[PDB]
């Protein structure tokens, strides 16, 4: 990345849902290359969500993503020999990445005895705006706002 940007990997659309986002989600939950287990977990969580709410799972997944998607983030900047927490605008792709990573992790530290159940509960509460990922977005926005004085550089 010294000589310029690197190309992005065009991951394929999912077969049984036809959405880019679910493939991104399965790649986020993937561990040690066991892709089949990751797909089983994601599909099971989506089906659990569909059973609980009664509608399409992708729409509620998108609602949760929008509820946990951040817009303002803070990065340490060194200008003139001094470092400060500068609020910075987040590009759409990085916002989707951050939202998915937050969802997967905060589901990993739930207490629902199974990762499929934890993931389903986390996505449902994120849809309704009660998840811990929603909270995390709240604190990141709060921190970005509280350092607004440093946004001029």
């Amino acid at each position: 990345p010294r000589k310029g940007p690197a190309p992005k990997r065009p991951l394929v659309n999912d077969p049984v849902y036809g959405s880019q986002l679910v493939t991104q989600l399965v790649n986020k939950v993937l561990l040690e290359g066991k892709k089949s287990l990751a797909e089983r977990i994601v599909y099971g969580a989506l089906e659990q969500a569909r059973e609980k709410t009664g509608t399409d799972p992708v729409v509620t997944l998108k609602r949760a993503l929008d509820n946990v998607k951040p817009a303002l983030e803070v990065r340490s900047r060194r200008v003139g020999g001094a470092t400060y927490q500068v609020p910075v605008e987040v590009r759409p792709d990085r916002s989707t990445t951050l939202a998915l990573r937050w969802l997967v992790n905060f589901s990993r530290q739930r207490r629902e005895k199974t990762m499929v159940e934890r993931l389903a509960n986390e996505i449902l509460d994120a849809s309704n705006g009660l998840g811990a990922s929603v909270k995390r977005r709240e604190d990141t926005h709060k921190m970005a706002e509280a350092n607004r004085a440093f946004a001029h550089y």
């Binding site: 060194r78 200008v79 003139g80 020999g81 001094a82």
Partner: protein, 126 residues
Amino acid sequence: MDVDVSTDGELPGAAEYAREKIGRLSRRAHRPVLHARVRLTRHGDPAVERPVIAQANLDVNGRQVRAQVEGVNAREAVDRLEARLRSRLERIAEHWEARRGGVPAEAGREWRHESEPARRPGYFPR
């Protein structure tokens, strides 16, 4: 400050002197010292004018500080090693007092690598 000395061959009392001298350098270090090792070696060849070789390694909060000297006996080598280590620790400080003269100053006077670039308008001043 705990120091481990790994000598070799014949160097009686070199370990104790080296430990006592090196352990006094902890207060000079501005960050906690995680590890400290000293090695004393002697040259087999009698033709070597400075046979004894002393080396040190300190882990100053992740920053590696090392020095190496030669002497005619253990005491001189240890003392020269202590001097070299003190110089290195002085040059390593990196707290505010050690970097207050290098921080860019003024507004337009003086220029440095990390000096803040001047803000320029779109249109030429004229």
